Write a protein that binds this ligand. Structure first.
Ligand SMILES: Nc1ncnc2c1ncn2[C@@H]1O[C@H](COP(=O)(O)OP(=O)(O)CP(=O)(O)O)[C@@H](O)[C@H]1O
Ligand SMILES: [Mg+2]
Length: 365
């Protein structure tokens, strides 16, 4: 029964100051190939940028938070998760004995597998290597990083990775059916933050996305700006709607920081105009209805880290989105818990159009 001591950007068993101290002591950024660091501030939001070398090349990773410490931990752990997610032969099986998951789009039988755990049944289940590692080039569709997460404890990572999967499922639902989600109305500090970021662009608008998992809220933030590359989107997912909002706003700040450095990002042909971009994306700029953040029920109340993991897993398993699978990606040398979470029927349409998942005929209205 581990206590949740921090629940601003995410649910953590440690304060960010302790974690930063711990990242530095263990020299994680150096060990993972960080070669350059930059510090930005987008309105009031610290953004951290990392340049990382590996055998696969040179990558830019970003971190952010409400505080400079949190931004620096976020950037460091983002680098760690990516390093951990690189293909590793030590844990690939080719003649696997047990249950296997073969995604819909696989026309042919996959040859490389990694063993995970089904989180409902606790039974072993094999996942394709292309569904675990990044980058992986051998298979039918591109590798990606959805569901991937690092933490101080494996529970932190499962929570964060699972919420990421729900987040991209909701966004995929919105895009595929071109749903117009309602505007989300917020107060106090969150509103002041929205206002403060808005001063950086033209408009910052909040949306409550349809969520296919009960007790999890998904929030989108969309911008309007006179420069087109500063019209970005941010997303957050949490049983706590205030966290969902914060993470969406933080992701906008991250996006704005990347655009201003001209960093090409799948992580954050002929030049478009701001007004045409609005018209191509009217579902985001013409919301259907309004929601008050106060009228949202706190279904899952956040006590202990194990109980919260258990609860979110249950809710996902109940949603009609297939199996909830965890694959361990902890490196031997750095003792940093990293997982890949798969929800076998969760949509990943926004990443690849062939990753449709369990899609209904008519959208949930
Ligand atoms: N206080 C903390 N302690 C340990 N790990 C943390 C942490 N805060 C963030 N992380 C980890 O660092 C990475 C960056 O997380 P962040 O909070 O910035 O959201 P995110 O990066 O998942 C959005 P995206 O997947 O699109 O890049 C994640 O693996 C996250 O779990
Ligand atoms: Mg992530």
């Amino acid at each position: 029964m581990t206590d949740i001591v921090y629940d601003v950007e995410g649910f953590r068993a440690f304060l960010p100051k302790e974690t930063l101290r711990w990242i530095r002591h263990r020299e994680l950024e150096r060990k993972v190939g960080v070669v350059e660091k930059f510090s930005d501030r987008v309105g009031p939001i610290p953004v951290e940028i990392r340049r990382r070398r590996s055998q696969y090349g040179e990558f830019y990773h970003a971190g952010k938070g409400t505080t400079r410490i949190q931004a620096r931990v976020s950037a460091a752990m983002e680098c760690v998760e990516r390093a951990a997610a690189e293909p590793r032969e030590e844990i690939i099986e080719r003649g696997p004995e047990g249950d296997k998951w073969t995604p819909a789009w696989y026309r042919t039988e996959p040859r490389e597998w990694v063993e995970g755990v089904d989180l409902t049944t606790r039974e072993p289940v094999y996942v394709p290597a292309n569904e675990v590692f990044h980058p992986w080039l051998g298979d039918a569709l591109p590798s990606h990083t959805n569901g991937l997460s690092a933490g101080r404890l494996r529970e932190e990572a499962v929570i964060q990775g699972l919420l990421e999967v729900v987040e991209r499922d909701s966004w995929s639902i919105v895009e595929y059916f071109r749903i117009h989600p309602p505007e989300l109305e917020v107060h106090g500090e969150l509103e002041e933050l929205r206002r403060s970021l808005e001063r950086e662009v033209g408009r910052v608008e909040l949306r409550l996305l349809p969520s296919r998992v009960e007790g999890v809220y998904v929030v989108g933030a969309v911008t309007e700006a006179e420069r087109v590359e500063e019209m970005v989107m941010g997303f957050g997912a949490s049983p706590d709607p205030e966290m969902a909002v914060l993470r969406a706003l933080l992701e906008v700040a991250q996006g704005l920081s990347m655009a201003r450095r001209g960093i090409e990002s799948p992580v954050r042909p002929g030049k478009l105009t701001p007004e045409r971009l609005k018209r191509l994306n009217r579902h985001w700029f013409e919301p259907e209805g309004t929601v008050e953040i106060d009228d949202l029920d706190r279904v899952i109340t956040t006590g202990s880290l194990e109980k919260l993991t258990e609860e979110l897993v249950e809710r996902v398993a109940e949603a009609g989105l297939g199996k909830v699978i965890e694959v361990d990606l902890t490196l031997e040398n750095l003792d940093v818990p990293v997982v890949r979470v798969r929800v076998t029927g969760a949509s990943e349409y926004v990443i690849d159009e062939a990753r449709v998942g369990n899609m209904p005929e008519k959208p949930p209205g």
